[PDB]
Symmetry: C3
Subunit: 269 residues, 3 copies
């Protein structure tokens, strides 16, 4: 079944690694610098991994040491706007679960709709809105092997990990924001009317990923921490043209702070 | 076509029954007690019915007498979160239509977002929000054999049936609420941010069913009455973990009142 | 690929035509009268066009002269509620692009939710809400041959074309409204609760088309102008039953003004 696929994937991964990570990190598009801070023990290209989706817009699974602990890092992820199903988008999370990963740190780039946000701000995700997503990764003809049929979503981002983020940030003098993330499919950016409405719904930041992974991670009983880099501002009255290159550059600008935050958080787990 | 399938299904059902019900009832998950009040003339397991979807999370069609009238009762229904298409979810409604059912009573369990609601409250559905549903049961390459191409939805829950509910409830001293139901796919429950936004949109109760059936029933010209059992409270500031067992228990608590209400309504039609 | 299909389609069209239109017009359902004002040089039934979707609820591509300029007119379009994929819905726009069309004028019928709107009003679309659409025409496994991967949507309806509309309308004494259009799938009309919520989101008019085309046109770098005929009023407190025949009749009522507006706009380009 899906269980047999996951077994095959994890068996392949276990044959390459000797570390036993209990922590996993999904790096957002344009946020690969963390891998430089990582003492890399094993590198596994996505193309070699059984049942992983082929050819992402290379993709690498890295196993090594960070903040004095064993971690697995996904460099590259699968996006719904690339034409992957939600099951493919979230397959790596199921794999991390079966590897024994208990804590998942997810980062992404997002548009800031909160008026106090500036480009390059780091925003801890304390909640999300998932209801715009057109396909749900939990819709399966059969009940789950692991977890509840109808998982509770009253705390999808674990409070202790949010508090830890803020503790570390205060200690390192990293300004840190928090708020509600809303997932859209993309790939087109949002209209002015859309930004206005999303803000009115209570969203602080909008992005094109992450939420499916967090849903699956919570259903599987993992502890999740999520963080957005604010790469562009989405104030509809003063909205200008956004450009992928500027978004990537802005993401890169914030990476040193993000890397430092994440390393020190892991160090403290 | 789909017409030929429906014929085959109804032909099979007609071969088992001798009653001529003009009233149909869809029982929500965790609300089977009504079948005890039913004088059952015929029992038809879902697994034996041509073109019905296989294996629900048994499923029975019961034909008998309730409130002095012939009725058909669906014990068990098909949910989008179980992986059925919207066409499969609503196929039983098309079948009831072709059987000659004119009045449809639909019940479900829902989360209460209206601050005056308490667990076990009965809420008459006076309107719904369907726009979060990711697939629409009316999207067909061919125009419908029965009904309008673009059906009006200014009164999806017939006023006379709502008034009747309230009349019966006052007479039996059953407290009765009313409000707007919003359908989500699930199967995960909603986040705090999601509950806040849904309430802000004007929803009173949120559930994972019913709306597709009501859309098809209205398109087919049937009279619909809908009622939710409030099984859990969804006030986002004071939200606690929900559990399937507690939701089912709460549903069961409300069933005697619901059964009494429904029997006396049917008695009065 | 999709590129080869488009080539085949355009090659077929080029073999029938001798004009070189740089302007394209998509006529909304119930708004065919513009073709009477058109000096028709070539008529191409949809059924003969390679890779066009078969059998619409005839369909014709007309090439001719209007407002002293060469134009292509789509009489008949493909709707998501008819069971076509979003790729099929927007294929004609890709074809117009490959024909060299730079300016696209799109018209439709819509329900008016702005309290100042009356039936037969013309409303220029100055922005849209696309996030209810369940499938996105840009979700492709491969990056686009033309355009950006993540197109900006800060100005999906070109300001100069909106200003031109208003200039022409003032000159011809045509009252003209403007506002935000929201796309829904249909085919059922909206409930009272839905009209209330859509208005609250900031929509002025709601319809069952157009947005997919505008997204693709903008991604392909075309200039878009959009206009709705308000065919029915959607004030939820005073909502009455809508009927397709009355909607079509109302659309027809507004056509002379719309045709005059469009001809004089094209004349001025
Ligand atoms: N404005 C935006 N909208 C959606 N996703 C984004 N990712 C980064 N910026 C974004
Ligand atoms: N809170 C809730 N959300 C969605 N569906 C439900 N069914 C019962 N309770 C529910
Ligand atoms: N009220 C309405 N809703 C959706 N689409 C429409 N097209 C015309 N009127 C409409
Ligand atoms: Cl709102």
């Amino acid at each position: 079944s899906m269980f047999e696929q996951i077994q095959e994937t994890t068996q392949f991964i276990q044959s390459k690694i000797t570390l036993r990570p209990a922590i996993g990190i999904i790096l957002g598009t344009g946020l690969g610098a963390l891998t430089n801070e990582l003492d890399i023990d094993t590198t596994i290209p996505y193309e070699t991994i059984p049942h992983f989706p082929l050819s992402t817009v290379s993709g690498k699974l890295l196993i090594g040491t960070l903040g004095g602990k064993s971690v697995v890092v996904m460099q590259g992820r699968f996006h719904y706007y690339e034409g992957y199903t939600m099951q493919q988008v979230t397959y790596p999370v199921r794999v991390m679960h079966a590897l024994g990963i208990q804590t998942l740190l997810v980062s992404n780039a997002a548009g800031g709709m909160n008026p106090t946000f500036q480009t390059s701000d780091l925003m801890v995700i304390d909640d999300h809105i998932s209801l715009l997503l057109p396909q749900n990764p939990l819709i399966c003809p059969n009940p789950p092997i692991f977890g509840d049929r109808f998982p509770d979503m009253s705390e999808p981002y674990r409070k202790s990990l949010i508090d830890l983020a803020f503790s570390v940030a205060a200690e390192l003098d990293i300004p840190l924001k928090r708020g509600v993330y809303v997932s859209v499919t993309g790939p087109q950016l949002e209209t002015r009317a859309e930004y206005r409405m999303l803000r009115q719904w209570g969203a602080d930041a909008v992005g094109m990923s992450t939420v499916p992974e967090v849903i699956v991670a919570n259903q599987l009983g993992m502890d999740v921490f999520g963080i957005s880099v604010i790469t562009d501002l989405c104030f509809p009255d003063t909205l200008e043209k956004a450009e992928l290159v500027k978004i990537l550059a802005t993401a890169a600008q914030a990476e040193p702070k993000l890397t430092m935050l994440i390393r020190e958080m892991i160090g403290r787990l």
